[PDB]
């Protein structure tokens, strides 16, 4: 029953722990840190780790990481490459996702890239436009596919 550990990084205010929440299955101002506990399997417990901005102690055995920054917000792009930088020494590869992530009614993330450009270290990272109300993807099963991709090659 051997646990894959997944973070989760972004921008403060962006909505990192209403993606945990919703992921990890509780139902429906921002702390240091969380962990949410989820097993999803096909026995598989994924333990979601939400982090607060400001301790290159919390990537131990780190297996994939969740970014998430409000696109109408500036510098939410670009700050991720300090999360990018702080924690991915390279701890961490391609078992990731990037998350532009509607909080609000989208005025500027609207239109050719309702998930904005992303920088060069980025664009690799696969990305989706997000919301629980607002225009969304699935990303319940974009979620439960890391995690099979994770664990695929740990043998
Ligand atoms: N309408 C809407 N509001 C959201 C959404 N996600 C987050 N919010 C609001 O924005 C806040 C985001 O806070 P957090 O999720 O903790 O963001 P953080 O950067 O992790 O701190 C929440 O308290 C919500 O009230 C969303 O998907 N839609
Ligand atoms: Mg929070």
Excluded at 77 to 94: I, Q, S
Excluded at 106 to 124: C, H, R, S, T, W
């Amino acid at each position: 029953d051997d646990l894959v550990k997944i973070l989760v990084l972004g921008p403060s205010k962006s909505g990192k722990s209403t993606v945990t929440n919703f992921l990890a299955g509780t139902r429906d101002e921002t702390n240091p840190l969380r962990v949410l506990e989820v097993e999803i399997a096909l026995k598989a417990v994924v333990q979601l780790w939400d982090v607060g901005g400001s301790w290159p102690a919390i990537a131990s055995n780190a297996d994939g990481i969740i970014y998430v920054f409000n696109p109408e917000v500036k510098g939410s792009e670009k700050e991720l490459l300090l999360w990018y930088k702080n924690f991915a020494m390279r701890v961490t590869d391609g078992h990731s996702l990037i998350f532009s992530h509607h909080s609000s009614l989208p005025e500027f993330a609207v239109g050719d890239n309702a998930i904005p450009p992303m920088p060069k270290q980025l664009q690799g990272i696969r990305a989706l436009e997000t919301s629980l109300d607002y225009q969304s993807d699935n990303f319940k099963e974009a979620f439960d596919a890391l995690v099979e991709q994770i664990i695929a090659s740990r043998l």
